[PDB]
Write a protein that binds this ligand. Sequence first.
Ligand SMILES: *[C@@H]1O[C@H](CO)[C@@H](O)[C@H](O)[C@H]1NC(C)=O
Lengths: 388, 145, 49
Amino acid sequence: NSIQIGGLFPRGADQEYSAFRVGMVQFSTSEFRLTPHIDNLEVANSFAVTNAFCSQFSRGVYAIFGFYDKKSVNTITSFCGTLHVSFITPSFPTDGTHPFVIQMRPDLKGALLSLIEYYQWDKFAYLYDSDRGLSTLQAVLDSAAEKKWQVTAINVGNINNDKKDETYRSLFQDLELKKERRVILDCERDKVNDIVDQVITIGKHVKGYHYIIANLGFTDGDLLKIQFGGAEVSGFQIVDYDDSLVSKFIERWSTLEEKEYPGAHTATIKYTSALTYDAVQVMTEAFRNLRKQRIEISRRGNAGDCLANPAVPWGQGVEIERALKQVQVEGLSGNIKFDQNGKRINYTINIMELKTNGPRKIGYWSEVDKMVVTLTEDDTSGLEQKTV
Amino acid sequence: TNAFCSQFSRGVYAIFGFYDKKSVNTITSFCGTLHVSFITPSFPTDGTHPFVIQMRPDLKGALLSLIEYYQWDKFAYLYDSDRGLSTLQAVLDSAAEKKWQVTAINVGNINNDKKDETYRSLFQDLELKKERRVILDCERDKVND
Amino acid sequence: IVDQVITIGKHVKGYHYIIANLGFTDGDLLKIQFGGAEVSGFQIVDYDD
Ligand SMILES: *[C@@H]1O[C@H](CO)[C@@H](O)[C@H](O)[C@H]1NC(C)=O
């Protein structure tokens, strides 16, 4: 029982592929076995993505797991929506209803707007990356008219390789011109790391500044460097390490050799890798349920060419999509459930704060509640003088 | 992608056509890879894209200069995503540099279904307070709507 | 020490540091360079010779 599936990874994805293998081994069963075909390629090049996809389709896979960028997303959604091949991804959710695409990554918009509303910011600067996507920008801009906000949006995404460190000094000093202490980041962990590092270099991490790191991994990058700064830093965490399942995972994860499973020896794991693992679980449950529901999905013939005119799609793909979207499980990212579009529904995003003794969980965010406050409310005698 | 891979098989020397925000990356990537020259009247790409000739002239500079000419320090900006978000970044950075109060609203790309329902209250909320200056960035038909 | 100073963020323009050692430019000076704080030290090897 070999089930051929496709996988598409960037040339710069190590821990993700490692976690993929971890999912392959941990969730492998005796009933059936998945047989992954792996292709490392440049994600930004649509031609390369298309080439690899037509190759995978020539192999005749049942489902494809992979990543995409703002350049290659339309190719993926259009091709999968065309040929009826199921696609699973950790990458950013598309804006719209895109069929045959399962976005494992949950939406952060609600939690962010709820957070800004929580801290009552009426004026701030918002740094955005064009290399990822401009959706959240539109979100907070449209929200600015309703909530009466003064938002100064700056693109950090257009920066050269050699001159990229000037634009940061100019940015922060122009913010000295605007005298605005509240900032939001939302970028790649590496780009974020560079930003934080330059914040430390210019030394704007002193008390009085307030930063919001918008990403799902709060603890994935090194944020220890800004910890003793004195500036308040809030972010979101999708992987709660205080869970039994997560701990039993980290136990095995930490016991892996870094030579065989790159960047897996760490006790902390990037949320993307976690999403990959959970994706493996989900696919496994989906095909297991297909065999359990007595639905014959095996293709008797070859799918052949993806460029055949007119395009002839296979039928079992619909059944696979239905199987995938109807999966409800428990992974590293918490409760996993999908809607008819494939987006994540009913998820819990921990709201985290960075203090002196490290990160602490203040909130828990949901789609329906839109807000939840954990007890918190610590009181100290320090800097509180009982009246005389 | 299919039509491009075709006709190229016929061995054409140059390809003339149009593109949208969804298919633009396909055209530019494929033409930049296979070295097939592509001509378009549609919106210019944001960046340096080789083997692509954008016949359409840039409109950002003229817009910012016109806005500066009418001396508007506060205005509303309605935009569609189908032509690109470059002009948006332009007016945002120009708002940061020239100290403008710009209220930009996207009606484009159907980015939110919510708004469609009870959008009138929004437009009227901006209609009661200020909003003396408005700029339309859309398709001729969308403009008409 | 310098690293702990930048981490706690006392390298702002109000503070003044003196490196008394023979190598001033031998250590990593990029990190406190952009701080805005004045840092003066001693150098025994003149590269202008
Ligand atoms: C999420 O759906 C679950 C099933 O895990 C249920 O326990 C709970 O109702 C949920 N939260 C909401 C807001 O429906």
